[PDB]
Amino acid sequence: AEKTGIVNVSSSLNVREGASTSSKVIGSLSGNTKVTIVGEEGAFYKIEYKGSHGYVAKEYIKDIKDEVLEHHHHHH
Fold this sequence. Notes:
Elements: E1 3-7, E2 13-16, E3 25-29, E4 34-41, E5 44-49, E6 52-57, E7 61-65
PDB class: structural genomics, unknown function
Keywords: SH3 family, Clostridium perfringens, Structural Genomics, PSI-2, Protein Structure Initiative, Northeast Structural Genomics Consortium, nesg, unknown function
Assembly: monomeric
């Protein structure tokens, strides 16, 4: 069951490849941007980053709810 967390920042959210507060930044994501979570580890959530696995703190994650959107958007 995949989970989507809503990003909440005053400017932007940094993405780390490790799990520490200052491990290694590989890029950043826009605010209110949804992130897919496949698991959790420590005080940080694991997400599927394009090219590898991104790690972010739970503090920048708010309102976590499932939302995979049913297939076939076109309504019969």
